[PDB]
Design a binder for this molecule. Structure first.
Ligand SMILES: *[C@@H]1O[C@H](CO)[C@@H](O[C@@H]2O[C@H](CO)[C@@H](O[C@@H]3O[C@H](CO[C@H]4O[C@H](CO)[C@@H](O)[C@H](O)[C@@H]4O)[C@@H](O)[C@H](O[C@H]4O[C@H](CO)[C@@H](O)[C@H](O)[C@@H]4O[C@H]4O[C@H](CO)[C@@H](O)[C@H](O)[C@@H]4O)[C@@H]3O)[C@H](O)[C@H]2NC(C)=O)[C@H](O)[C@H]1NC(C)=O
Ligand SMILES: *[C@@H]1O[C@H](CO)[C@@H](O[C@@H]2O[C@H](CO)[C@@H](O[C@@H]3O[C@H](CO)[C@@H](O)[C@H](O)[C@@H]3O)[C@H](O)[C@H]2NC(C)=O)[C@H](O)[C@H]1NC(C)=O
Ligand SMILES: *[C@@H]1O[C@H](CO)[C@@H](O)[C@H](O)[C@H]1NC(C)=O
Ligand SMILES: *[C@@H]1O[C@H](CO)[C@@H](O)[C@H](O)[C@H]1NC(C)=O
Ligand SMILES: *[C@@H]1O[C@H](CO)[C@@H](O)[C@H](O)[C@H]1NC(C)=O
Ligand SMILES: *[C@@H]1O[C@H](CO)[C@@H](O)[C@H](O)[C@H]1NC(C)=O
Ligand SMILES: *[C@@H]1O[C@H](CO)[C@@H](O)[C@H](O)[C@H]1NC(C)=O
Ligand SMILES: *[C@@H]1O[C@H](CO)[C@@H](O)[C@H](O)[C@H]1NC(C)=O
Ligand SMILES: *[C@@H]1O[C@H](CO)[C@@H](O)[C@H](O)[C@H]1NC(C)=O
Ligand SMILES: *[C@@H]1O[C@H](CO)[C@@H](O)[C@H](O)[C@H]1NC(C)=O
Ligand SMILES: *[C@@H]1O[C@H](CO)[C@@H](O)[C@H](O)[C@H]1NC(C)=O
Ligand SMILES: *[C@@H]1O[C@H](CO)[C@@H](O)[C@H](O)[C@H]1NC(C)=O
Ligand SMILES: *[C@@H]1O[C@H](CO)[C@@H](O)[C@H](O)[C@H]1NC(C)=O
Lengths: 729, 728
C-alpha cells in the first residue's frame, strides 16, 4: 500500500509497452521479422537468422517509408510512402519497386501516385494495382502495365476495390481483387453506387481553410438503395499490348437475381475452381456457387446442382456473414463452420457433388475459426476448454478418426495462457501460438510433426519486471444465473481489493450482436487506470445477443435491438449492486458505438440503478445506420416488415427519463460510420424535453477519435466526468 | 423575506413589459392592434373606432401571422404560412380582403412562397417578389405585370437582398422603393454568381434519414463579393401586351473603378432619387442625386451634384453612411456627419452648393434625425447631463440654430433618461417611448406647443407585481483610464452592502460602436443572477464603443481584438480594487463579438478571470463576412492587414486557457457566425491539451431563440456560473 499506481498519463503516453512478435511467413520453413527497421529472415526449424534487408539501404531515398511488401519469390520489394488514410481499411499511397538482385529502384513504368490498392500474385512477382477505380496488371515490375477495366469513376463505379459499406460490413477490407493460387487468373468484384444516396457532413480542416469542405460519401442507410455487384475473372497469361484484356463475368445464381443480394465471400479452391458465396438483402438465405474453368471454351460454369444453400429460421446466416470455406488441396471437398441442430457452431465436412455435410465437431461450445488444413489434420480454435466461452485454445482433429481430438495450447501454461490465436507456415509445417491473457502475452513457435515446443519468440519479461513495481488491478472472470442460464461477466478489481469495503462500479458496455466483453485477455487500457489509481470496479457483462455461446443466446435479439441486451445490462448491474463490495449510490455506465446506444437506452430506462454515464459516438436510431449491418438484425424499416420496432427502439423517445441521470454525450464531426447526425438528434430530443447534460464534439475526428491529441483529450474529459460523478479527489 | 426574480421567471416570462406599437396612417390618426382588433385612434381627442373586428377572420382556415392595410384603407394583406429564412428574410402566402365589398379577393391571388410584398405609399398598388422576380398589381383583383425575368435562386436577386446585403447593409430583405406617389418603383439587382457558398448540415426532424446540406452565397473576408445594379420602372405606363422598360441608374465613376456597395436609397421628391454608394474599402462614400427627364424618360445624375463623405481616422458612418432627410422641395437635406473634433452632428446640405453647414456642435453625438418641418428639425442625442448612455428628443429652430429645446428631458427625469420617438406623417403629433431607468412609459404629444396630451401605457400592472419581488438596482457611473471617462453599469443585488464582498460576472459585447452601459430597464438573465444568486453583473464601454466621438470609436481601426480586449481586463481589474467585489470570483461572458472578446480575455493570461462563457463566438476574422469585417480590418492580404488578421485569432491563444474554466456554446445551423468558428477554437484547445466544457445546439441559428433551446442554454450557463462561484 502507498506505492506507484497505473496513472492516466501511463495509459496516454504509453509508459508500459506490450512487445509483439509480428512475423510474415514467406515459405513452409522461413518467416520475415522487422527489428529496429532491419528486416531479418528466420529459419523455423533451427532458429538461425540473417539480415534480409539492411535499415541503411533506404537512407538517401527522399521519402518516409510507411510499409514494405516483398514479392513471394524474394526478387522485389514494394516501398509504400505518402500514406493518406480514408476509412477503416481504405487509403491512398505512392509506390516504388526495388530490385533486390540488381540492388536498384525501378525508375521506368512506375506505379502511379494516389494508388488505391497494390498486391503481388501469391507466387512469382506479378502486380495488380487499382488507380482511379480501374484495375491494372504488371507481368514484370520494369515493363508497362495492362489496363483491365475502363468503367471506373470516383464515387460511382469501383473496379477491384470496395465501396464504403462493402469495406466496413462485408469484406472488412478495401481490396476486391483475388489472384488464383499459381497467379494465372485475377478475379475481381465491380460495385455500382449510381443510385446509392450520399451522407454529407462538414470537414473544417486547418485554420487556413476559409470555407469548410463538404465530404460526400455513397452510404446506404437502413432501407435505402444498396450498391449492385458484378463478378469478373481475367487470364493474366494472355495479355497483349495490341488488344484489350477480355474479362469473363460470373453471373450470381437465379435465386439471388430475383431481388437485392450481396457478394459476401470469394475463395479459390484450385487453379480452375472458384467458390463464390452470395447473400440475399434479407440475410437468412445464402448460396455458395462452385465455378469451374472450361479449358476449351474459356468460360466459367457454375452448375446449379453443385450449389450449397445455408439458411436460418431463428435469425441471420453466420456470426456477421456466411463463414469462410477451407478446401482440401484437390478442391473436391471443404470444411465450413455451420450452426448445428442444437444451435452451436461446429465444423461441417462438405463433398462437392454430394448432398448435406457431416459434422466432425459437436458439444455445448463453439469453433471460433478453422486455422489450417493438412492431409492428416484440420487445425481449429474453440472455447471448449473448462466450458469458458471467453477462452480460446488451438485444437487438432485427425481426419481418419474424428474422435481423436488433441488440444495443442490448453496445457502449455494453464495459469498464464487461456486465450490463443495462431499463424501457420505456408503448408502448416510450423505454427506461431500467440497468448494474449490472462497473464502477459507470450509468443512461441512449434513444429506440426510432433507438436514440439521449439522456441520462445517474446515472453514480455521487460514489462513483467516493470509491473511488479506498480499497484496493478486483478481481473475476475465468472458468471451469474438469469432464468437458469449462465451469463459471463468480468470485473477489473482495484489493487488490494477488499470484500468488506464498498467500491463505485463503472459498467463498460458494447453488447452488440455476437459481441464478447467478458474474456481472459490482458489489456493495459482506461479501465486499468480507473481500478489502479481511482479504485473503481470496471465491470463488463455478456447478456442476450452476445456471441460464442450458441444461437439460443445470440439470436434472442433478432428483429429486436435495444431490448434484451439493454434489460440484461441493467439486471447485471442490479445483481452486482446486491453483492456486498459495490456502492449502489455510485454505479456508472459507458460505451462506444453500439456501446453508446446501449449506454443511452439504459440511462433512458428509468431503472434507478445508474447515477451517470458516457455515450461516445452512439447509434441513436437504426434508420441512420448502414443497410448491411442494421438489416442483418432488424430487417427493413417498412410497415410490412419491422418499422414498428425501428421506431420503438430510439434513444430520442426516452428523453424524459434522462432527468434522473447525469449524461455526457461525445461524437466526432467527421464520423463517416456512426454519423454525427445520431448524437445531433439525441441532443435535440434532450433540449426539446428540457433535460440538462454535458456534451463534447471533436472537430474532424472519425469513429476512432484516434488522433494523438483527441485520444488524450476525450479520456481526460471522461476521467473528470467519472471522478466528479463518484466524488473522488 | 419576499420572493426573488428566479431563472423560471426570466424563461417562462412571468413579468411582462407591456408595449404600445402604433403605425401612423395620416398626420392625425394612428392604427393600434388590441385583442386581435385593429383600432384607428384620433391623436388630438383620443377617441377610436374598430377598423377590423377580431371575429371577421374566424372561418379563414389559416393562422394569420401579420396584417398590412393599404394607405387608402380600401384593402388589407393577410400574411399566413410564415416560414422564416434569415434575420429579416422569410417566405409566406398572401390573401387580400376588400373592406368595401367585405370579401376575400378570390381571383389573380398573390402566389404561395412570395418573398416580399409592399403597398405603394399612397393608394392600393402592390409590388411583390416571387422566384427572385418583381411583379406589380395596380388593382388587387386584376392580374399582375412581370417586371424582371432574370431572377434565379441563389444567383440573381431582383427586388430582394442576398445574405450579406440583408444582414450588414440594408438590415432588411426588401430591395424595393416606391416613389412618394405610386408612379415609380425603384429596385436593386444583386448578382451572387461568383460568390462562394457556406455549406453546413441541417438534421431536421427525427424522421429525416439523410441530413440536408444548406448552401448559402456568403462572401467571407477578402472573398468575391456580390455585384449590384439599380433600376427604376414607371408603373403608370404598364401595358398588358408589351414588357415593362427598366431604366438603369449607373453608379458614379469613382465607384466603378473597383468593388463597391449600394448602401442607401432615399426618394427626395416625385421626380428625384438620392443613391449613396460605398467603396469595398469603406473610407470613401458618394451620394448621387438623380432627376427624371420627362421628355427622354431617362434618369440623369449630374456629376456636380455629387456629395463625397470620407474618413481618415477609420470608416464612413457608425455602420454605414447615414440616411439623408430632404426638405419638402428636395433642393436641400440634413445628414448626421462626423465634425472636425470627431463628434457626430447634423449638417445642412443645399443640392447645387459644395460642402454643408453644421447645425449642432459639442462633446456629445446626435443619434438620429427623427422629423423635419419648415420651422423645426426633431433629433435624438445624448447631450443631457453629459451621459452617452442617455437618449432625449430635442428640437432645433431652423431660423436660429442657437434656439435648442429638449422635449423629453424634464417629463419625468428620475424614471425616464432613454427616449425613442415616432412622429405623425407631417410631424403634428409624436409618441415618446421611455425605456428606463424606470418601467417603460408611452406618452402622446402635440408638436404645436409640445403639450403632453395623454398616457398610452405606463406599466402600472407590472409595477404592482414587482413590489412583491426582491428586485436588483442598477448603478450607471464611469472610471478614469489614461485621463479619459469610460462608462460602466452594474446590476447590483437587492439589499446591496458595500461592506460585504460579491462575485462579479462581466457581461461583454464591446464590438465597434457598441454601448452596454446605458439607462435602459431590462428583465433579462442578469436580473436573475443579481436577484436570486447575489451576483454583480457589470458591463463596460471601452475603446471602440460608440456615441462618444471617433477618438474612442476609431481607436480599434484595423486592430480588432486589441484595445477593446485590454480595456475589459482593466475595467474588471479596477472593479476588483473596489471593496465590495471578490477578486477570486470574477467571470466574463458574451455572444458573437462578445464571444470573441470573452475568448480573447480568457486567452490573455491576465489572471483576473477564473471562468467564462463564449456563445456563438467569432474565432478568426477571415471566417466572418466581407462587409462587416473589412469595414474595421481592411482586406486579408499581405499588401493590406493580413498580419493583424492572423495575429487576432482565439486559436493562437489556446495555451493560456489552461489557467481558466471555459464553456464554448454554438448552434450548428448558425448562418451568421458559422459553427466552423467554434469548431476551430475546440480543435486548437484539444491540439494543446486544454480541458473545457462545450455544448452544440442542433439546427439552432445565431439567436438560439427556439422556446426549448433558449430555456436549455440559460439553464446550462446558470449551472456553469453557479459551480464556478461555489453557490448553493
Ligand atoms: C451502374 O448502374 C446504373 C443503374 O443503376 C447504370 O446506368 C443505367 O444504365 C441503363 C442502361 O444503359 C440506363 O437505361 C437506358 O437509358 C437509355 C436512355 O438514356 C437516357 O435516359 C435515361 C432515363 O430514361 C437516363 O437515365 C440516362 O442518363 C440518359 O439520359 C435508354 O435508351 C435505354 O433503353 C435501351 O434498352 C432497352 C432494354 O434493353 C431497350 O428496349 C431500348 O430499346 C434501348 O435499346 C438500346 O440498348 C439496347 C441494349 O441491348 C440495344 O439493343 C438497342 O439497339 C439500343 O441501343 C436504357 O433504358 C439507365 O437509365 C441508367 N440509369 C442511371 C440512373 O444512370 C450504369 O450503366 C451502371 N454502370 C455499369 C458500368 O455497370
Ligand atoms: C451575373 O454576373 C456574371 C459574372 O459574375 C455574369 O456572367 C458573365 O457574363 C459575361 C457577359 O459579358 C460573360 O462574358 C462574355 O462571355 C462570352 C463567352 O461566354 C464571350 O464571348 C463574351 O465576349 C463575354 O466575354 C461572362 O463569361 C460571364 N461569366 C460567368 C462566370 O458566367 C452574368 O451575366 C450576370 N448576370 C446578370 C443577369 O447580370
Ligand atoms: C540500424 O541497424 C544497426 C545494426 O543492426 C543498429 O545499430 C541501428 O540501431 C539501426 N538503426 C536505427 C534503429 O535507426
Ligand atoms: C541457417 O543456417 C544454414 C546453415 O548454415 C544456412 O544455410 C541458412 O542460410 C541459415 N538461414 C538463415 C535464415 O540465415
Ligand atoms: C508523384 O509526385 C511527385 C511530385 O509531383 C513526382 O515527382 C512523381 O513523378 C510522381 N510519381 C509518378 C509515378 O509519376
Ligand atoms: C479498349 O476499350 C476502350 C473502351 O472502353 C477504348 O478506349 C480502347 O480504344 C480499347 N483499346 C484498344 C486497343 O482497342
Ligand atoms: C415497444 O416498447 C415498449 C417500451 O419498452 C414496450 O412496452 C413494447 O412491448 C414494445 N413493443 C412494441 C411492439 O411496440
Ligand atoms: C375580440 O374583441 C373584444 C373587444 O371588442 C374582446 O373583449 C374579445 O376578448 C376579443 N376576442 C378575441 C378572440 O380576440
Ligand atoms: C373621433 O370623433 C369624431 C367626432 O365624432 C369623428 O368624426 C371621428 O371619426 C372619430 N375618430 C375615430 C378614429 O373614431
Ligand atoms: C397555395 O396553396 C394552397 C394549398 O396549400 C392552395 O389551395 C392555393 O391555391 C395556393 N395559392 C395560390 C395563390 O396558388
Ligand atoms: C418579355 O421578355 C421575355 C424574355 O425576357 C419574353 O419571354 C417575352 O416574350 C417578352 N415579351 C415581349 C412582348 O417582348
Ligand atoms: C405622380 O408624380 C409623377 C412625376 O413624374 C407624375 O408623372 C404623375 O402624374 C403623378 N401622379 C399623380 C396621381 O399626381
Ligand atoms: C501580435 O499580438 C501580440 C499579442 O500579445 C502583441 O504582443 C504583438 O505586438 C502583436 N503584433 C503582431 C504583428 O501581431
Amino acid at each position: 500500500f502507498s506505492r506507484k499506481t497505473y496513472t492516466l498519463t501511463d495509459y496516454l503516453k504509453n509508459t508500459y509497452r506490450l512487445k509483439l512478435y509480428s512475423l510474415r511467413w514467406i515459405s513452409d520453413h522461413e518467416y520475415l521479422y522487422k527489428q529496429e527497421n532491419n528486416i531479418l529472415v528466420f529459419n523455423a526449424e533451427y532458429g538461425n537468422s540473417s539480415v534480409f534487408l539492411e535499415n541503411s539501404t533506404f537512407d538517401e531515398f527522399g521519402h518516409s517509408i510507411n510499409d514494405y511488401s516483398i514479392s513471394p519469390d524474394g526478387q522485389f520489394i514494394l516501398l509504400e510512402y505518402n500514406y493518406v488514410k480514408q476509412w477503416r481499411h481504405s487509403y491512398t499511397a505512392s509506390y516504388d519497386i526495388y530490385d533486390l538482385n540488381k540492388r536498384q529502384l525501378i525508375t521506368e513504368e512506375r506505379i502511379p501516385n494516389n494508388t488505391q490498392w497494390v498486391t503481388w500474385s501469391p507466387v512469382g512477382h506479378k502486380l495488380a494495382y487499382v488507380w482511379n477505380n480501374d484495375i491494372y496488371v504488371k507481368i514484370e515490375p520494369n515493363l508497362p502495365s495492362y489496363r483491365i477495366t475502363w468503367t471506373g469513376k470516383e464515387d460511382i463505379i469501383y473496379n477491384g476495390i470496395t465501396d464504403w459499406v462493402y469495406e466496413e460490413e462485408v469484406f472488412s477490407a478495401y481490396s476486391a481483387l483475388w489472384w488464383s493460387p499459381n497467379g494465372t487468373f485475377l478475379a475481381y468484384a465491380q460495385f455500382n453506387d449510381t443510385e446509392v444516396p450520399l451522407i454529407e457532413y462538414s470537414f473544417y480542416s486547418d485554420e487556413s481553410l476559409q470555407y469548410p469542405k463538404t465530404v460526400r460519401v455513397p452510404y446506404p442507410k437502413a432501407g435505402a438503395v444498396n450498391p449492385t455487384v458484378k463478378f469478373f475473372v481475367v487470364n493474366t497469361d494472355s495479355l497483349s499490348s495490341v488488344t484489350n484484356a477480355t474479362s469473363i463475368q460470373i453471373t450470381a445464381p437465379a435465386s439471388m437475381l430475383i431481388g437485392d443480394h450481396y457478394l459476401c465471400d470469394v475463395t479459390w479452391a484450385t487453379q480452375e475452381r472458384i467458390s463464390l458465396q452470395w447473400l440475399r438483402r434479407i440475410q437468412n438465405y445464402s448460396v455458395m456457387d462452385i465455378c469451374d474453368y472450361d479449358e476449351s471454351s474459356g468460360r466459367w460454369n457454375c452448375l446449379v446442382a453443385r450449389q450449397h444453400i445455408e439458411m436460418s429460421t431463428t435469425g441471420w446466416v453466420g456470426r456477421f456473414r456466411p463463414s469462410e470455406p477451407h478446401f482440401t488441396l484437390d478442391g473436391n471437398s471443404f470444411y465450413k463452420i455451420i450452426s448445428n441442430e442444437e444451435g452451436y457452431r461446429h465444423i461441417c465436412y462438405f463433398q462437392i457433388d454430394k448432398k448435406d455435410c457431416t459434422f466432425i465437431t459437436k458439444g455445448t461450445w463453439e469453433v471460433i475459426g478453422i486455422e489450417a488444413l493438412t492431409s492428416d489434420y484440420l487445425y481449429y480454435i474453440s472455447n471448449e476448454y473448462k466450458g469458458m466461452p471467453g477462452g480460446r485454445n488451438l485444437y487438432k482433429i485427425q481426419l481418419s478418426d474424428y474422435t481423436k481430438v488433441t488440444c495443442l495450447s490448453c496445457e502449455l501454461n494453464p495459469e498464464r495462457c487461456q486465450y490463443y490465436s495462431v499463424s501457420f507456415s505456408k503448408e502448416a509445417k510450423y505454427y506461431q501460438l500467440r497468448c494474449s491473457g490472462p497473464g502477459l502475452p507470450l509468443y512461441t513457435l512449434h513444429s506440426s510433426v510432433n507438436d514440439k515446443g521449439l522456441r520462445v519468440l517474446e515472453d514480455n519479461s521487460a514489462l513483467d519486471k516493470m509491473l511488479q513495481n506498480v499497484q496493478m488491478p486483478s481481473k475476475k472472470l465468472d458468471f451469474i444465473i438469469l432464468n437458469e442460464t449462465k451469463f459471463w461477466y468480468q470485473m477489473i478489481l482495484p489493487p488490494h481489493f477488499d470484500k468488506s469495503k464498498k467500491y463505485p462500479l463503472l459498467l463498460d458496455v458494447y453488447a452488440g450482436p455476437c459481441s464478447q466483453k467478458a474474456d481472459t485477455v490482458f489489456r493495459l487500457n482506461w479501465a486499468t487506470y480507473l481500478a489502479s489509481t481511482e479504485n473503481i470496479i470496471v465491470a463488463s457483462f455478456d447478456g442476450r445477443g452476445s456471441g460464442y455461446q450458441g444461437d439460443k443466446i445470440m439470436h434472442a435479439i433478432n428483429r429486436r435491438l435495444g431490448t434484451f441486451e439493454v434489460e440484461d445490462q441493467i439486471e447485471a448491474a442490479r445483481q452486482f449492486s446486491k453483492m456486498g463490495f459495490v456502492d449502489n449510490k455510485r454505479i456508472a455506465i459507458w460505451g462506444w458505438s453500439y456501446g453508446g446506444y446501449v449506454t443511452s437506452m439504459v440511462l433512458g430506462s428509468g431503472s434507478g440503478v445508474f447515477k451517470c454515464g458516457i455515450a461516445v459516438a452512439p447509434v441513436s436510431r437504426w434508420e441512420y445506420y448502414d443497410s448491411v449491418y442494421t438489416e442483418r438484425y432488424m430487417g427493413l424499416p417498412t410497415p410490412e416488415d419491422n418499422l414498428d420496432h425501428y421506431r420503438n427502439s430510439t434513444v430520442m423517445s426516452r428523453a424524459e427519463n434522462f432527468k434522473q441521470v447525469e449524461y455526457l454525450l461525445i461524437h466526432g464531426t467527421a464520423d463517416d460510420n456512426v454519423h454525427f447526425q445520431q448524437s445531433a438528434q439525441i441532443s435535440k430530443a434532450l433540449v426539446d424535453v428540457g433535460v440538462d447534460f454535458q456534451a463534447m464534439w471533436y472537430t474532424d475526428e472519425d469513429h476512432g477519435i484516434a488522433s494523438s491529441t483527441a485520444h488524450q483529450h476525450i479520456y481526460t474529459h471522461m476521467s473528470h466526468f467519472i471522478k466528479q460523478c463518484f466524488s473522488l479527489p
